Design a protein around this ligand. Sequence first.
Ligand SMILES: *[C@@H](C)C1=C(C)C(=O)N[C@H]1Cc1[nH]c(/C=C2\N=C(C[C@H]3NC(=O)C(CC)=C3C)C(C)=C2CCC(=O)O)c(CCC(=O)O)c1C
Ligand SMILES: *[C@@H](C)C1=C(C)C(=O)N[C@H]1Cc1[nH]c(/C=C2\N=C(C[C@H]3NC(=O)C(CC)=C3C)C(C)=C2CCC(=O)O)c(CCC(=O)O)c1C
Ligand SMILES: *[C@@H](C)C1=C(C)C(=O)N[C@H]1Cc1[nH]c(/C=C2\N=C(C[C@H]3NC(=O)C(CC)=C3C)C(C)=C2CCC(=O)O)c(CCC(=O)O)c1C
Ligand SMILES: CCC1=C(C)/C(=C/C2=NC(=C\c3[nH]c(/C=C4\NC(=O)[C@H](C)[C@H]4CC)c(C)c3CCC(=O)O)/C(CCC(=O)O)=C2C)NC1=O
Ligand SMILES: CCC1=C(C)/C(=C/C2=NC(=C\c3[nH]c(/C=C4\NC(=O)[C@H](C)[C@H]4CC)c(C)c3CCC(=O)O)/C(CCC(=O)O)=C2C)NC1=O
Ligand SMILES: CCC1=C(C)/C(=C/C2=NC(=C\c3[nH]c(/C=C4\NC(=O)[C@H](C)[C@H]4CC)c(C)c3CCC(=O)O)/C(CCC(=O)O)=C2C)NC1=O
Ligand SMILES: CCC1=C(C)/C(=C/C2=NC(=C\c3[nH]c(/C=C4\NC(=O)[C@H](C)[C@H]4CC)c(C)c3CCC(=O)O)/C(CCC(=O)O)=C2C)NC1=O
Ligand SMILES: CCC1=C(C)/C(=C/C2=NC(=C\c3[nH]c(/C=C4\NC(=O)[C@H](C)[C@H]4CC)c(C)c3CCC(=O)O)/C(CCC(=O)O)=C2C)NC1=O
Ligand SMILES: CCC1=C(C)/C(=C/C2=NC(=C\c3[nH]c(/C=C4\NC(=O)[C@H](C)[C@H]4CC)c(C)c3CCC(=O)O)/C(CCC(=O)O)=C2C)NC1=O
Ligand SMILES: CCC1=C(C)/C(=C/C2=NC(=C\c3[nH]c(/C=C4\NC(=O)[C@H](C)[C@H]4CC)c(C)c3CCC(=O)O)/C(CCC(=O)O)=C2C)NC1=O
Ligand SMILES: CCC1=C(C)/C(=C/C2=NC(=C\c3[nH]c(/C=C4\NC(=O)[C@H](C)[C@H]4CC)c(C)c3CCC(=O)O)/C(CCC(=O)O)=C2C)NC1=O
Ligand SMILES: CCC1=C(C)/C(=C/C2=NC(=C\c3[nH]c(/C=C4\NC(=O)[C@H](C)[C@H]4CC)c(C)c3CCC(=O)O)/C(CCC(=O)O)=C2C)NC1=O
Ligand SMILES: CCC1=C(C)/C(=C/C2=NC(=C\c3[nH]c(/C=C4\NC(=O)[C@H](C)[C@H]4CC)c(C)c3CCC(=O)O)/C(CCC(=O)O)=C2C)NC1=O
Ligand SMILES: CCC1=C(C)/C(=C/C2=NC(=C\c3[nH]c(/C=C4\NC(=O)[C@H](C)[C@H]4CC)c(C)c3CCC(=O)O)/C(CCC(=O)O)=C2C)NC1=O
Lengths: 164, 164, 164, 176, 176, 176
Amino acid sequence: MKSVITTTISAADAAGRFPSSSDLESVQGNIQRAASRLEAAEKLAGNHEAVVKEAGDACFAKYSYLKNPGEAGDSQEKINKCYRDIDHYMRLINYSLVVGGTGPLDEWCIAGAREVYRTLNLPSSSYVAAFVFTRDRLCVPRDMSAQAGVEYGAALDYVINSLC
Amino acid sequence: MKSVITTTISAADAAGRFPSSSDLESVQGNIQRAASRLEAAEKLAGNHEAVVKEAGDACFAKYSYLKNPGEAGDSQEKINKCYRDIDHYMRLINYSLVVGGTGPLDEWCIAGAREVYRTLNLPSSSYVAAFVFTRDRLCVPRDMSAQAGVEYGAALDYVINSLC
Amino acid sequence: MKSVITTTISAADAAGRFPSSSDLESVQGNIQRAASRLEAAEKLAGNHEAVVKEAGDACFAKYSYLKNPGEAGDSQEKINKCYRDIDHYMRLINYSLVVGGTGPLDEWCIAGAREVYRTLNLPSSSYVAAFVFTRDRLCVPRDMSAQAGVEYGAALDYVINSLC
Amino acid sequence: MLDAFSRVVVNSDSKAAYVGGSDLQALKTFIADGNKRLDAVNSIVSNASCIVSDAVSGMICENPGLIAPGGNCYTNRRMAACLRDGEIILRYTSYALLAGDSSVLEDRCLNGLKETYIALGVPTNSSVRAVSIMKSAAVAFISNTASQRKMATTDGDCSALSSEVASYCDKVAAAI
Amino acid sequence: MLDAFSRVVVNSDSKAAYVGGSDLQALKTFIADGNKRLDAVNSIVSNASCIVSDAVSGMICENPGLIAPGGNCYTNRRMAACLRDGEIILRYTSYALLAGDSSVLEDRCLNGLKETYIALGVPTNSSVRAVSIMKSAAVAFISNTASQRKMATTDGDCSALSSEVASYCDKVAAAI
Amino acid sequence: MLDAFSRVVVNSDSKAAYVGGSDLQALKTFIADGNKRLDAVNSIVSNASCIVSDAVSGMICENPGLIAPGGNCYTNRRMAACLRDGEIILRYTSYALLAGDSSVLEDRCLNGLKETYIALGVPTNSSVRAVSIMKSAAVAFISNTASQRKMATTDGDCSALSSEVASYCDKVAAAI
Ligand SMILES: *[C@@H](C)C1=C(C)C(=O)N[C@H]1Cc1[nH]c(/C=C2\N=C(C[C@H]3NC(=O)C(CC)=C3C)C(C)=C2CCC(=O)O)c(CCC(=O)O)c1C
Ligand SMILES: *[C@@H](C)C1=C(C)C(=O)N[C@H]1Cc1[nH]c(/C=C2\N=C(C[C@H]3NC(=O)C(CC)=C3C)C(C)=C2CCC(=O)O)c(CCC(=O)O)c1C
Ligand SMILES: *[C@@H](C)C1=C(C)C(=O)N[C@H]1Cc1[nH]c(/C=C2\N=C(C[C@H]3NC(=O)C(CC)=C3C)C(C)=C2CCC(=O)O)c(CCC(=O)O)c1C
Ligand SMILES: CCC1=C(C)/C(=C/C2=NC(=C\c3[nH]c(/C=C4\NC(=O)[C@H](C)[C@H]4CC)c(C)c3CCC(=O)O)/C(CCC(=O)O)=C2C)NC1=O
Ligand SMILES: CCC1=C(C)/C(=C/C2=NC(=C\c3[nH]c(/C=C4\NC(=O)[C@H](C)[C@H]4CC)c(C)c3CCC(=O)O)/C(CCC(=O)O)=C2C)NC1=O
Ligand SMILES: CCC1=C(C)/C(=C/C2=NC(=C\c3[nH]c(/C=C4\NC(=O)[C@H](C)[C@H]4CC)c(C)c3CCC(=O)O)/C(CCC(=O)O)=C2C)NC1=O
Ligand SMILES: CCC1=C(C)/C(=C/C2=NC(=C\c3[nH]c(/C=C4\NC(=O)[C@H](C)[C@H]4CC)c(C)c3CCC(=O)O)/C(CCC(=O)O)=C2C)NC1=O
Ligand SMILES: CCC1=C(C)/C(=C/C2=NC(=C\c3[nH]c(/C=C4\NC(=O)[C@H](C)[C@H]4CC)c(C)c3CCC(=O)O)/C(CCC(=O)O)=C2C)NC1=O
Ligand SMILES: CCC1=C(C)/C(=C/C2=NC(=C\c3[nH]c(/C=C4\NC(=O)[C@H](C)[C@H]4CC)c(C)c3CCC(=O)O)/C(CCC(=O)O)=C2C)NC1=O
Ligand SMILES: CCC1=C(C)/C(=C/C2=NC(=C\c3[nH]c(/C=C4\NC(=O)[C@H](C)[C@H]4CC)c(C)c3CCC(=O)O)/C(CCC(=O)O)=C2C)NC1=O
Ligand SMILES: CCC1=C(C)/C(=C/C2=NC(=C\c3[nH]c(/C=C4\NC(=O)[C@H](C)[C@H]4CC)c(C)c3CCC(=O)O)/C(CCC(=O)O)=C2C)NC1=O
Ligand SMILES: CCC1=C(C)/C(=C/C2=NC(=C\c3[nH]c(/C=C4\NC(=O)[C@H](C)[C@H]4CC)c(C)c3CCC(=O)O)/C(CCC(=O)O)=C2C)NC1=O
Ligand SMILES: CCC1=C(C)/C(=C/C2=NC(=C\c3[nH]c(/C=C4\NC(=O)[C@H](C)[C@H]4CC)c(C)c3CCC(=O)O)/C(CCC(=O)O)=C2C)NC1=O
Ligand SMILES: CCC1=C(C)/C(=C/C2=NC(=C\c3[nH]c(/C=C4\NC(=O)[C@H](C)[C@H]4CC)c(C)c3CCC(=O)O)/C(CCC(=O)O)=C2C)NC1=O
């Protein structure tokens, strides 16, 4: 799981080194940034249902054609799965915010996503629309602190760039 | 076993590809040439005893020195083994004609042959004489059709070139 | 175990060759030099206690600081281990003289020695002093024949160079 | 690997025999049905995406635990790996159909698959279900009885080829 | 490898849950003790040579057969290999302490160690003794109670960190 | 690998002893017979082709099933592989004779040979027969009693060396 801690430790391990000053300093950075990203994680975990609902609504409001027969949202079960997927992504972002790195996203949502979405006719633009809406909907300080939003928006941007 | 089919399939497998147009076309070639080579195979399998006898006779008529003491044909059992070897080769040619490739020859007669014949003092020129006689003795259309002979002579030439 | 015999055989094995003239000639060299090095081995094995005692005495006479607290010879058990180590080295030299190569030294004393001596604060200069004393103390023909001394001194020089 | 012809040759070699007239007759039958065999392969490879994604999706909709946390299709990485396995298996089955012999499938795909899946934790029961769905799909495309796509061929009888396709899928299911 | 944070995330993922407030509280405790954790690691790595050589020497002085002919520390090659193993184990224990999770140690050091030592003939009982001596040494350096070296820190309570160090050394001893 | 000298040294090292006078005497005996040992090796390597091909041919003429379809010497590929194995074994036996120790043979040739032959299907009984024919041939060439080739040496007694050659061939037969 990609994080400050695992990245530094793996670097040391590859060179067969004990932790030294630079490794301790990296962890210190994790301590320093923890407050903002744990705030963002806590805010997201306490309100994810409304966030997911709004995001999925934005996806289908922007792409009504998804509800046409033969398309990804042509049945209620498929629409439900769309909202479920958005939920999975928000959960992985919650995890990324807690870990301090993109590891949970990289391993549990991004790896293999393109093969899945192409075999399943799930247009990438729809997920991107859900995440763009979420990023633009964030209101500071109404929803979280400035730096918490920097962390939250950065994770959302990382997801979007993975789908670009 | 080297054939049109195995060659094309292995090529596709190395690239992780399903069969496509070129693979199907190759097999079509196997269908087209099957008539001539199966005719040659059938003719050979129905008369191999006389063919082998004639070939071995030609080898010892050209190389009487083989019957001298210390040479490869200095006893009756060794002469018998010589005719047996020629039989094995004609059988492998029968197999090559059926498969449509040189695979049976390559794996069951040619691979390791030079090491064997050198350790056993079996002069390559003797086998070549048996096969040259057989190639030159073929009579068209008395023995088989023109294209059947093209296939039969080609397999014989392949064996000869392997011993060159 | 590095020797004339093993070196030549391994060379032949790497090339998949039977022994040939050069391999037999190498062993002949082992036969020729055996007399001098077996004499040196026999002389060493029959008087090793006095040799070791003299060598250790020379080490501590040259480096009295070793007996200071915190140093390698600050207790009687550690001094005893110093003489024991010198004994081990003389035994390995005895083995090298018998084998005709540096193999026993290379594998049983030199490999890993630097890591051990650095982790154990054992100064290399002390072992070198013991071996230099031994090399310079050798008296010809009082102690052994000229060529026996060439072999004995060469093994000692090899040890010293390993610690340089 | 062997094809139908080299299979005959290996069997003949077991007896140091020249290829018997009976075997030559059978191979001539194989030749006579060659065009049908090529249409059969074309019908599978031209719909491989449909076959694989429908079979993996069916496996999942019959067993939704596969996509719950802990399910072997949970996360995109695992679903992608499973779609890839479905495609690989179909590819080797199509090679066996083109060659007329199951050696390519047995040697380059199935040899060790059971142990590998045990090591990884891939459920064998779910795998056999995906493979049997692909089996029904592939047979339908061979017989040109898929509901949603047709492939125009000259009329005739390809039951033997569909039976062959099914026998290869059965080898896959048996091996795991 | 996982750290304390990714460990929490993996546990949460088992339930398809967002990270619970209880877990967030615990991680905030980890953050609050971060500086103490860094001092703990510094105290071990700054004395790694002392720790390892004292532990290997202790193992030997309690069992001198190790350095007799046939002993697994006999010859410089074996002693060097054993000092290297002691250092490697301490290094992975320090990684576990920095990360707050034992996964790095279990996966990159201990996985297969028992079998390897069986294959080579390294005595497991002597190994556990070296590791438990390192355990006592490391704990002392964490708690700043080593007799011969002190490390100046601001006064406080690092019992939890020393207990963690000990639990990692115990994993090592248990694995072999 | 070890030779006769390093073998003595390894045995001495087991006791942390300097090489005993008794061992030195034995090694001096080895030196004294050095020229005979070199003639012995020359007599084998100078007739290696004869030895190997006669032994493989004998193995086959005593068991003609080896060259029937299904026999492990059937086809030129298998016969060539078997002649190569006979040569390899003789080569390692000649190394053991040159070195005066069987370690080279045990470690670089025989270690794993039994399992390999089980895996491949090479018949062990036929292998031992080829090796024992080579044994008789090699002994004859050492003792200069081969019927069809003589090797001129100064007269003397090489029974010990032929016994050694036989003991190495026996190790080969025992290992499989
Ligand atoms: C691919 C896009 C398809 C086209 C084109 C078409 O016309 N039919 C598709 C392929 C196909 N599939 C089958 C057989 C089965 N497919 C199954 C999975 C579906 N069943 C479900 O409950 C779900 C809901 C998510 C899925 C995806 C199953 C089950 C079968 C039956 C397997 C069996 O045991 O018989 C066929 C062949 C026959 C048929 O029409 O069902 C084809 C051509
Ligand atoms: C490293 C140079 C040390 C400094 C600095 C220091 O102040 N103490 C050294 C490290 C250290 N070692 C321990 C614990 C033990 N060390 C042992 C080995 C020694 N015991 C022997 O009999 C010998 C004689 C050759 C050796 C090398 C042993 C045993 C222990 C006890 C392990 C146990 O089971 O408790 C400690 C921690 C506590 C202590 O002071 O003993 C430290 C800091
Ligand atoms: C190599 C070309 C030879 C020369 C030169 C020579 O003078 N003798 C040849 C080598 C040789 N072989 C043996 C022992 C045996 N060789 C055997 C195989 C032959 N026996 C058969 O029935 C056949 C017929 C095809 C073959 C090839 C066998 C059996 C033995 C006996 C093994 C045993 O168990 O004793 C010898 C040594 C003694 C001897 O003269 O037989 C030599 C020098
Ligand atoms: C597997 C393929 C195959 C070969 C290679 C083959 C060779 C072959 N040709 C033969 C006869 C013959 N082959 C020929 C050749 C010819 N006849 C003509 O009309 C031509 C002018 C002339 C050469 C161009 C002749 C004249 C004979 C009978 C005379 C003889 O035995 O030499 C015979 C003796 C058995 C028999 O009389 O039929 C053999 C074995 N038979 C086969 O089945
Ligand atoms: C393994 C090989 C080996 C070595 C290295 C060795 C060293 C050695 N030389 C010694 C004696 C001696 N060695 C010498 C050296 C010399 N005598 C002369 O005639 C020369 C002029 C002069 C040097 C060129 C002398 C003078 C003594 C006796 C005086 C003394 O103890 O220092 C002693 C004391 C034991 C004894 O009296 O024999 C040892 C241990 N002994 C051995 O077996
Ligand atoms: C934990 C991380 C994780 C992710 C991210 C994930 C995505 C994911 N969504 C799926 C299904 C699906 N996902 C969707 C979603 C969509 N419908 C639309 O209209 C939109 C285009 C689109 C979303 C924007 C749909 C429709 C399906 C069903 C596709 C089908 O069966 O035809 C599948 C295939 C298995 C299944 O049916 O559940 C995966 C692997 N699965 C995971 O385990
Ligand atoms: C020679 C042809 C060939 C085959 C057959 C093959 C199979 C294969 N599938 C794998 C993984 C996998 N395979 C699956 C497949 C599935 N999970 C389910 O629930 C479904 C029932 C099932 C469909 C079979 C999954 C999920 C993984 C990932 C395992 C993991 O990530 O933990 C792996 C381990 C490496 C990897 O992750 O890609 C192999 C070797 N690889 C090849 O080269
Ligand atoms: C390049 C690869 C290649 C292909 C693809 C190919 C197709 C092909 N299929 C044919 C016949 C045929 N194709 C079929 C196949 C079937 N009929 C049905 O109703 C079944 C559903 C279907 C399932 C496979 C049949 C029955 C025939 C007629 C009998 C025969 O000629 O074999 C013919 C001969 C008559 C013609 O169309 O000109 C060709 C050339 N030939 C090739 O060389
Ligand atoms: C068979 C080949 C072999 C060799 C060569 C060898 C060397 C060797 N000497 C050691 C110890 C030691 N060796 C010495 C020797 C010294 N004291 C001094 O004053 C001098 C500087 C120095 C020698 C010149 C000392 C003091 C120790 C104990 C170090 C300690 O525990 O603090 C050790 C560590 C294990 C032990 O305590 O016995 C090794 C491996 N061990 C072997 O098995
Ligand atoms: C992933 C981290 C890692 C570990 C854990 C590791 C262990 C390890 N220790 C080894 C050897 C060895 N290890 C020891 C250690 C000791 N002998 C004793 O008596 C002591 C009780 C004991 C301390 C544990 C010894 C003596 C050898 C040499 C074995 C020999 O030369 O015969 C070897 C075989 C290769 C070599 O000689 O270096 C491995 C793989 N290597 C790695 O990369
Ligand atoms: C670059 C790596 C790095 C290090 C090394 C580091 C050390 C460090 N340790 C601190 C406090 C402290 N450090 C300790 C540690 C301990 N006190 C004891 O008596 C125990 C024996 C000892 C065992 C580890 C304690 C108790 C505190 C005070 C409580 C706390 O601030 O966490 C502080 C905060 C107050 C200060 O000193 O300015 C820092 C910056 N910070 C970093 O970023
Ligand atoms: C299935 C494919 C296949 C082939 C091709 C084959 C060739 C072959 N022929 C052999 C023997 C032999 N082959 C011959 C043949 C000859 N005598 C002569 O005068 C001519 C020079 C020469 C043929 C032109 C002879 C004489 C031997 C016995 C050699 C001996 O033992 O001294 C042997 C050694 C084993 C044996 O004694 O049977 C092989 C491997 N074996 C196979 O399994
Ligand atoms: C380290 C020295 C060394 C040895 C000992 C060795 C043995 C060896 N013999 C092999 C094959 C073989 N070995 C034989 C030998 C024989 N068949 C019989 O019937 C005879 C009784 C028997 C004589 C022993 C045969 C026939 C094969 C081919 C197996 C096959 O092609 O199916 C193989 C498999 C790879 C290959 O085909 O070459 C090995 C590794 N390779 C080495 O590098
Ligand atoms: C370059 C490799 C090399 C070789 C090949 C070699 C041969 C060699 N063999 C010798 C003696 C001898 N060689 C033999 C060997 C034997 N006598 C028999 O009747 C046995 C059948 C036979 C079986 C091996 C014997 C008995 C002696 C005389 C005793 C002896 O000097 O060892 C001698 C000493 C006398 C002389 O010929 O000048 C040499 C140099 N020396 C070398 O350095």
